[PDB]
């Protein structure tokens, strides 16, 4: 269904941004070595 | 070369971010459908 | 710490390949529709 | 139109795919350190 959908891409937006965040934490621990 | 890798890992985060965006606006279209 | 970001980063690699297959599957099913 | 959300779709898969390649070439080149 859509609704199921559009569930599975708000998961999955969480994810990325979490993913995002993640990259970014690990570009600024390079940064400090 | 460990800029560089700061320097690519900006530019994957810049795309992912962007992804997001594009994601989310799917998301809001298909909720409207 | 090296190694302990390269483990970090196939944990990423890990999680994004699996949104790529989710999102492989979502298209497949609006192409359904 | 449900069809430019399966071309925008593809065209993130496509997206997906390149970063996943160089976050994996990253992480290559950081254990070659």
Redo the contacts between chains.
């Keep these: 269904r859509?609704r199921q959908?559009?569930d599975?891409?708000?998961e999955?937006?969480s994810?990325?941004?979490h993913?995002?965040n993640?990259?970014?934490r690990?570009?600024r621990?390079?940064?400090e070595?």
Excluded: F, N, V
């Design positions: 859509m959908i559009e599975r891409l708000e999955i937006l994810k990325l941004h993913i995002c993640e990259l970014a690990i570009r621990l390079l940064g070595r």
